[PDB]
Amino acid sequence: FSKPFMSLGISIMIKKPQKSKPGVFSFLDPLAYEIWMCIVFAYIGVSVVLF
Amino acid sequence: RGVQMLLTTVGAFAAFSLMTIAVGTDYWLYSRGVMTHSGLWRTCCLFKGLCKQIDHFPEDTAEYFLRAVRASSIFPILSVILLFMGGLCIAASEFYKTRHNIILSAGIFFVSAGLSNIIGIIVYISANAYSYGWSFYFGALSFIIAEMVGVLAVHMFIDRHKQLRATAR
């Protein structure tokens, strides 16, 4: 054999994750998409109580 | 005059009908081991076609109390009974209006029935721990119509009280 011209080794292949961040859907992430409806319902109910 | 009373009456009737439809079936949706609908009494799969009462209450004391409330639908059934009682009171107050103060108690009972129905919706949403049924949205819309009908009823009551106060002088 001659001298090695190209050195190499064992590496790791991943799925290469990108910045796949949605838009308006990212806003209502942290609490729920269903507790907010009960919040608005209690809002209009308390307004009914005040009126 | 009669137009607002008739609109309030048909709003209460539509709210009672949507509350009955929310009691009936298709309240929620939950994917079993395939999708399956539920109406707070029995679950029905989307083999296919069979239905059974899947409202089993067993598998601190606050967890047992919340499970007891979520069992057998203590809040929304009494809420619907109070809505029917408020509708009967509004029907008794529509014809032969002798006492001009029963409409206030009927509206207070109607607002309390709406608040109890909202509390029962909160209990059923809390006990759910993937989609939702159409009768849940129908019950929410009936809660909206009930709130608007309560506002219209107390508006007509304060208008009648102001008319009686203007006629008393």
From Swiss-Prot, chain A:
Taxonomic superkingdom: Eukaryota
Location(s) in or outside the cell: Cell membrane; Endoplasmic reticulum membrane; Postsynaptic cell membrane; Postsynaptic density membrane
Tissue expression as described in the entry: Detected in cerebellum (at protein level).
Annotated transmembrane regions: 33-51
Additional notes on this entry: The postsynaptic actions of L-glutamate are mediated by a variety of receptors that are named according to their selective agonists. This receptor binds AMPA (quisqualate) > L-glutamate > kainate.
Role of this protein: Ionotropic glutamate receptor that functions as a ligand-gated cation channel, gated by L-glutamate and glutamatergic agonists such as alpha-amino-3-hydroxy-5-methyl-4-isoxazolepropionic acid (AMPA), quisqualic acid, and kainic acid. L-glutamate acts as an excitatory neurotransmitter at many synapses in the central nervous system.
Comment on protein domains: The M4 transmembrane segment mediates tetramerization and is required for cell surface expression.
Family listed: Belongs to the glutamate-gated ion channel (TC 1.A.10.1) family. GRIA1 subfamily.
Subunit-structure text: Homotetramer or heterotetramer of pore-forming glutamate receptor subunits; heteromeric assembly can be the result of both receptor subtype and flip-flop forms and according the composition, one partner can be dominant with respect to the fast desensitizing current component, whereas the other can determine the steady-state component. Tetramers may be formed by the dimerization of dimers. Found in a complex with GRIA2, GRIA3, GRIA4, CNIH2, CNIH3, CACNG2, CACNG3, CACNG4, CACNG5, CACNG7 and CACNG8. Interacts with HIP1 and RASGRF2. Interacts with SYNDIG1 and GRIA2.
Name of this chain's protein: Glutamate receptor 1
Annotated source species: Rattus norvegicus (Rat)
Gene: Gria1
Portion held of the full protein: 505 to 555 of 907
From Swiss-Prot, chain B:
Gene Ontology CC terms, in alphabetical order: AMPA glutamate receptor complex; cell surface; cerebellar mossy fiber; glutamatergic synapse; hippocampal mossy fiber to CA3 synapse; postsynaptic density membrane; Schaffer collateral - CA1 synapse; somatodendritic compartment
Record flagged with keyword Nucleus: no
Keywords: Calcium, Calcium channel, Calcium transport, Glycoprotein, Ion channel, Ion transport, Membrane, Phosphoprotein, Synapse, Synaptosome, Transmembrane, Transmembrane helix, Transport, Voltage-gated channel
Domain of life from the UniProt record: Eukaryota
Membrane topology label: Multi-pass membrane protein
One example of a Gene Ontology biological process annotation: regulation of AMPA receptor activity
Subcellular location: Membrane; Synapse, Synaptosome
Recorded GO MF terms: calcium channel regulator activity; channel regulator activity; ionotropic glutamate receptor binding; voltage-gated calcium channel activity
Spans through the membrane: 5-25, 72-92, 102-122, 138-158
Function: Regulates the trafficking and gating properties of AMPA-selective glutamate receptors (AMPARs). Promotes their targeting to the cell membrane and synapses and modulates their gating properties by slowing their rates of activation, deactivation and desensitization. Does not show subunit-specific AMPA receptor regulation and regulates all AMPAR subunits. Thought to stabilize the calcium channel in an inactivated (closed) state.
Oligomer and partners: The L-type calcium channel is composed of five subunits: alpha-1, alpha-2/delta, beta and gamma. Interacts with the PDZ domains of DLG4/PSD-95 and DLG1/SAP97. May interact with GOPC. Acts as an auxiliary subunit for AMPA-selective glutamate receptors (AMPARs). Found in a complex with GRIA1, GRIA2, GRIA3, GRIA4, CNIH2, CNIH3, CACNG3, CACNG4, CACNG5, CACNG7 and CACNG8. Interacts with GRIA1 and GRIA2. Interacts with MPP2.
Similarity comment: Belongs to the PMP-22/EMP/MP20 family. CACNG subfamily.
Name by which UniProt lists this protein: Voltage-dependent calcium channel gamma-2 subunit
UniProt source species: Rattus norvegicus (Rat)
Complete-protein stretch covered: 6 to 213 of 323
